Design a protein around this nucleic acid. Structure first.
Ligand SMILES: [Mg+2]
Ligand SMILES: [Mg+2]
Length: 678
DNA sequence: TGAGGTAGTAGAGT
RNA sequence: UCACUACCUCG
């Protein structure tokens, strides 16, 4: 089922001979740099050298004649001087096809774009972003409309412009002025005189014209010397820290800093905060900006790139009988059923089950295979030991899950409770007390949650795919698994299960935690399906390096099971627009060779497609996406809308956020098949 | 604690 | 990229 789409991408003139072979230059430093300061230096050499020059491995490359370049000089860095000397070595062929050779011609490209944007006037330029419109306003803050840009070289050897509309948030106040009129201290702050940022620790009381700095020179006097106090009024002392060592406090003046605002627009003298846009309005705005930018780039007219898209088959979601969203099963019956025993704990004003909720479940179960039993919890949490007594009995009386009716709780308490009950072997769902059965979606979801935690498989996928087991990995340390993380798997009926890496105190071998996770997963599966997966689908947030998966990919290799490793990123797939007609769910867009885009959802703004990369395996992208897309509907606690990410990933994401704030210890007997974290 | 989407913040000292 | 907040959204 083919179709073609438009990317927020525009083709431009191919790289002429000149641009085809950049100039190369040797770089001699003084005093000798290091092995950790070496590369962070070259990037600076190319900068002081001027022109369109970039670091090309050992030395730097350039689209500028060595004439315009300052082929010799000095450079400081954290209070250390340096002396360099550039030597042309003529030129060197370069390849558009070659992974690496391209990367250079693209870096030059961004630099080419970088220099053009800086010479534009009447525009707020920040990096590669270009802002030009008054959109919102308010007590000293203004949200400007603009676009985030990017120019790189393609496989063909042509220029590629990337455009996508965006809003920037600017404060034309100054820390002092900001605070001076009833505003909290911002997390981050920026220099009024330049572009660097810092972490704002705390305000100081030291006298600005007295506080001495390395040397003896006054704090104030130090800035004034540089002219950045002219027309400004550096008030109180403020303490900040560099985003490299957020521990070493540095002195700064509140009058020379500017708060880094973040959607705290608390008034609108220009407009509503609607910072989103509909797909053909932004598409329109894209074509424009792109035409403009390309206009003053001088790279020729921008050609929007058409791409080959495929329409993936809609998934058949079943409960007792076919259904659309999970919430329907609450009336159509569940997929796999039997007696569950749900207990009720009320932490508000009265005693029983709100009529509707009781009838809701009764019907749901009546609609599904077997029927349920409904207990109430006699003890309140304050009764201390008395409470746990009733609990440990109800855990034996069958109760597999608790439904908590209570007013909003500070997460301080919300955690206490869930922790207790859980260590007692009782998953729990909360539902805030002021509740009217008008709010279908709210209690309905609450109910769907209870049953997912109770341990029921609400819906399932009618069919078979290449991988019987799909497992998603999520880490708790954005960088890697050296601090743990969890995993979630689905595949089969379709029974979903979670897994947790045993508790450590320090750092663990990243690639061992992952094997730790995968094997535990395969055991729970074997022991639950009696079979060992012929093939596995491994999903990851591509946040972490790909080698942390080495041990496991070789482990599976010694068990005889085949796999595919796919990395799923939520950012960076740009946008996709329908040529003519509307777009549908499950649009599969293959791009550069091991990558593709997935528009898993739509049904307000513009869908943000997922960018996936097949890092290992051999099954074809088509079958991969088809399956990943289908996994999009297996999320238990949705009921009224499907998530953007595949159930395994979306599950691990929320399981790593729970273990985080609850306490991995208490996760004693909790069946690895009762999704307590949803 | 209903939950999902989009949409912004972002990770040469002073 | 997580938490954050806004807005809907819920045939
Ligand atoms: Mg994640
Ligand atoms: Mg929940």
């Amino acid at each position: 089922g083919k179709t073609e789409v438009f990317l927020n991408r525009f083709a431009l003139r191919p790289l002429n001979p000149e641009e085809l072979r950049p100039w190369r230059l040797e770089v001699v430093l003084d005093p000798p740099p290091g092995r950790e300061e070496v590369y962070p230096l070259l990037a600076q050499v190319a900068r002081r050298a001027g022109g369109v020059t970039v670091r090309m491995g050992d030395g730097l490359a350039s689209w500028s004649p060595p004439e315009v370049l300052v082929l010799e000089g000095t450079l400081a860095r954290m209070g250390q001087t340096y002396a360099y000397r550039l030597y042309p070595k003529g030129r060197r062929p370069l390849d558009p096809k070659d992974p690496g050779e391209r990367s250079v011609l693209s870096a030059l490209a961004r630099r080419l774009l970088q220099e053009r944007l800086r010479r534009l006037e009447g525009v707020w330029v920040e990096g590669l972003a270009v802002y030009r419109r008054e959109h919102a306003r308010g007590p000293g803050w203004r949200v400007l409309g603009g676009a985030v840009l990017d120019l790189w070289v393609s496989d063909s050897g042509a220029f590629l412009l990337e455009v996508d509309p965006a809003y920037r948030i600017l404060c034309e106040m100054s820390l002092e002025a900001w605070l001076a009129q009833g505003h909290p201290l911002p997390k981050r702050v920026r220099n009024a005189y330049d572009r660097r940022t810092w972490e704002l620790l705390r305000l100081g009381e030291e006298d600005p014209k007295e506080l001495p700095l390395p040397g003896g020179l006054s704090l104030l006097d130090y800035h004034a010397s540089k002219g950045r106090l002219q027309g400004r009024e550096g008030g109180r002392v403020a303490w900040v820290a560099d985003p490299k060592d957020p521990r070493k406090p540095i002195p700064h003046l509140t009058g020379l800093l500017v708060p880094v605002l973040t959607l705290e627009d608390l008034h609108e003298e220009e407009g509503s905060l609607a910072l989103s846009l509909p797909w053909e309005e932004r598409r329109r705005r894209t074509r424009e900006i792109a035409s403009w930018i390309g206009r003053r780039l001088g790279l020729g007219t921008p050609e929007a790139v058409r791409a080959q898209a495929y329409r993936l088959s809609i998934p058949k979601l079943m409960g007792r009988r076919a259904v659309s969203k999970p919430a329907d099963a609450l009336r159509v019956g569940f997929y796999r059923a039997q007696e569950t025993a749900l207990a009720l704990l009320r932490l508000d004003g009265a005693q029983g089950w709100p009529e509707f909720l009781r009838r809701a479940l009764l019907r749901a179960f009546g609609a599904s295979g077997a029927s349920l039993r409904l207990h109430t919890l006699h003890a309140h949490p304050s009764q201390g030991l008395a409470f746990r007594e009733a609990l440990r009995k109800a855990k034996e009386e069958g109760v597999q899950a608790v439904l908590v009716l209570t007013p909003p709780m500070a997460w301080e308490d919300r955690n206490r409770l869930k922790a207790l009950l859980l260590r007692e072997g009782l998953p729990s769902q909360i539902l805030n007390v002021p509740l009217r059965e008008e709010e279908r979606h709210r209690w309905e979801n609450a109910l769907l949650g209870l049953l997912a935690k109770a341990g029921l498989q609400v819906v399932a996928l009618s069919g078979a795919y290449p991988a019987e087991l799909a497992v998603g990995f999520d880490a708790g340390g954005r960088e890697s698994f050296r601090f743990g993380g969890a995993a979630c798997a689905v595949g089969g009926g379709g029974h979903l299960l979670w897994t947790l890496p045993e508790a450590q105190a320090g750092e663990r071998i990243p690639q061992e935690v992952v094997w730790d996770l995968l094997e535990e997963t395969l055991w729970a599966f074997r022991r639950k399906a009696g079979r060992l997966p012929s093939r596995v689908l491994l999903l990851r947030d591509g946040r972490v390096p790909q080698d942390e998966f080495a041990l496991a990919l070789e482990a599976l290799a010694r068990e005889g099971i085949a796999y595919d490793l796919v990395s799923v990123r939520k950012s960076g797939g740009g946008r996709v627009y329908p040529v003519q007609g509307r777009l549908a769910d499950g649009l599969y867009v293959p791009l550069e060779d091991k990558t593709f885009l997935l528009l898993t959802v739509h049904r307000r703004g513009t869908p943000r497609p997922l960018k996936l990369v097949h890092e290992a395996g051999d099954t074809p992208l088509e079958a991969l996406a088809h399956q990943i897309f289908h996994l999009t509907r297996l999320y238990p606690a949705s009921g009224f809308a499907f998530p953007r990410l595949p159930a395994p990933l979306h599950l691990a994401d929320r399981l790593v956020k729970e273990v985080g704030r609850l306490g991995i210890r208490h996760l004693k007997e909790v069946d690895r098949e009762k999704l307590f974290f949803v």
